[PDB]
Amino acid sequence: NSTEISELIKQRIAQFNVVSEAHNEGTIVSVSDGVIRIHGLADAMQGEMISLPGNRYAIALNLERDSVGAVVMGPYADLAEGMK
């Protein structure tokens, strides 16, 4: 039932209203010692400046699969998970 079951999965996922991250957006998933890990953010270049909440900016240095590793340029003790 390949087509039927894949359609079933699609309709339940759509009815659940879960959705992908928008490209050029992501969420912080770890903060530690001035280094942050971000989920999503597909259209991110290496060396790009990513805007954090506030006017603070972060440098995306490492583009792993399913994760972006960035360095905070300034104080970092104000950040947390769930931040767009």
Partner: protein
């Protein structure tokens, strides 16, 4: 059409995923648009299902996960032939002199195997150079490898410029200069010097400098070898100058760990010996043609114990060991006469006279070194009169090893000197036999032949 996508960008290393059929093979080239910039990737490992891990031949900045990659089904290929003469090129064989297209007839892949054992050709055709100590302690033959070992600032570049002047101009064949990891200023200065001297028409230049990402510094030496080997297969006698083998190995070291390898004894890659061997066994004189090569070898911390100089010692016919001690004392060139040798220094290969002269010089200087600390602590007059005679002759001999160069004229304010080999043998034979015992030490310092020594002695 494009067939792959980028999945990781860690530093200078890029991973690309392809369909599990038609995965690129090792040392292939790939292409991706880094914005408006065409960027080339070189495949280094086939790992996992459909994934290849590669090195960027350019800046890795500006790359995104998910970019399309197009797999060229050949290695990095460079122009080869007469069209490369008089042109500066990068690692990919693209002109960087702003004179236009290369205009090549044929292009060759930079990854190729070394000559088979039965292709090797034996030679003992001694080259003559104007430098006294090199011709005396380490004469070398056409078709062989030469390495100038030295620490920081001991005279590698000046000696290589002098040797270019002395050898290449008499040489009627084509020459290749591979600027592996060179300073930009010194490359520009070399280019303009050759352009002024009107010898640029017989030299091909490949420059990969300090500022460029590790892949360029890794593969530029192979580009140079490819051009030299084209000339060799045409049957001509080629002169190949390599600026630093050290930074080929170092460009390997930078990216080794990012490729997943476990580190070696002194932090080097586990593949140092093989990486050296695959490159250096291609630089040989075969039965069709001969490559004669001069290489400058950096010595970290001025310590010859380090694995890189240690392994490259085992690849060379003649090894001129420069020392920071002799450079600091002001003797130029700073060649150590006790350490420098050549396998052409045989009484059969060279004149029997030449062999005996070299052996005697080395014996005397070895005997001086043991007395250095004796005299330093206990005093000059503790010596016997025979010992004091030996000390005198040793200091005179160690002065006569020095020489002014035409290319070391800007640093010192004196003309340059070229000494024939016969004159060098005659002078050192005369000094050891005591024919010039009565001249002062500076009468031998910074002069040419021994006739010039007696002329300066008269002036003194």
């Amino acid at each position: 059409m494009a067939t792959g996508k980028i999945v990781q960008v860690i530093g200078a290393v890029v991973d690309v995923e392809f369909p599990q059929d038609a995965v690129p093979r090792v040392y292939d080239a790939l292409e991706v648009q880094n914005g408006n910039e065409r960027l080339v990737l070189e495949v280094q490992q086939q790992l996992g299902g459909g994934i290849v891990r590669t090195i960027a031949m350019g800046s890795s900045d500006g790359l995104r996960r998910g970019l399309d990659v197009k797999d060229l089904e050949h290695p990095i290929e460079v122009p080869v032939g007469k069209a490369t003469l008089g042109r500066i090129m990068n690692v990919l064989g693209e002109p960087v002199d702003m004179k236009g297209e290369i205009g090549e007839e044929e292009r060759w892949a930079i990854h190729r195997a070394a000559p088979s054992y039965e292709e090797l050709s034996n030679s003992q055709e001694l080259l003559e150079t104007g430098i006294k100590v090199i011709d005396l302690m380490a004469p070398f033959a056409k078709g062989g490898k030469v390495g100038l070992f030295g620490g920081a600032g001991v005279g590698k570049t000046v000696n290589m410029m002098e040797l270019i002047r002395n050898i290449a101009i008499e040489h009627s064949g084509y020459s290749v200069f591979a600027g592996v990891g060179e300073r930009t200023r010194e490359g520009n200065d070399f280019y303009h010097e050759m352009t002024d001297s009107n010898v640029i028409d017989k030299v091909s230049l490949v420059y990969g400098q300090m500022n460029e990402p590790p892949g360029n510094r890794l593969r530029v030496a192979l580009t140079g070898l490819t051009m030299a080997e084209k000339f060799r297969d045409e049957g001509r006698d080629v002169l190949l100058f390599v600026d630093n083998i050290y930074r080929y190995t170092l460009a390997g070291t930078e990216v080794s760990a990012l490729l997943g390898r476990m580190p070696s004894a002194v932090g080097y890659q586990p593949t140092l010996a093989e990486e050296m061997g695959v490159l250096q066994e291609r630089i040989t004189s075969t039965k069709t043609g001969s490559i004669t090569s001069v290489q400058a070898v950096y010595v970290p911390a001025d310590d010859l114990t380090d694995p890189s100089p240690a392994t490259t010692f085992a690849h060379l016919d003649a090894t001129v060991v420069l020392s920071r001690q002799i450079a600091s004392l002001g003797i130029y060139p700073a060649v150590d006469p006790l350490d420098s040798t050549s396998r052409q220094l045989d009484p059969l290969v060279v004149g029997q006279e030449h062999y005996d002269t070299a052996r005697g010089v080395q014996s005397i200087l070895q005997r001086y070194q043991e007395l250095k600390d004796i005299i330093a602590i206990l005093g000059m007059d503790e010596l016997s009169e025979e010992d004091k005679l030996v000390v005198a002759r040793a200091r005179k001999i160690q002065r006569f090893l020095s020489q002014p160069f035409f290319v070391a004229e800007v640093f010192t304010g004196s003309p340059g000197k070229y000494v024939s080999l016969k004159d060098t043998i005659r002078g050192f034979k005369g000094i050891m036999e005591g024919e010039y015992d009565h001249l002062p030490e500076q009468a031998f310092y910074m002069v040419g032949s021994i006739e010039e020594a007696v002329e300066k002695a008269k002036k003194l």
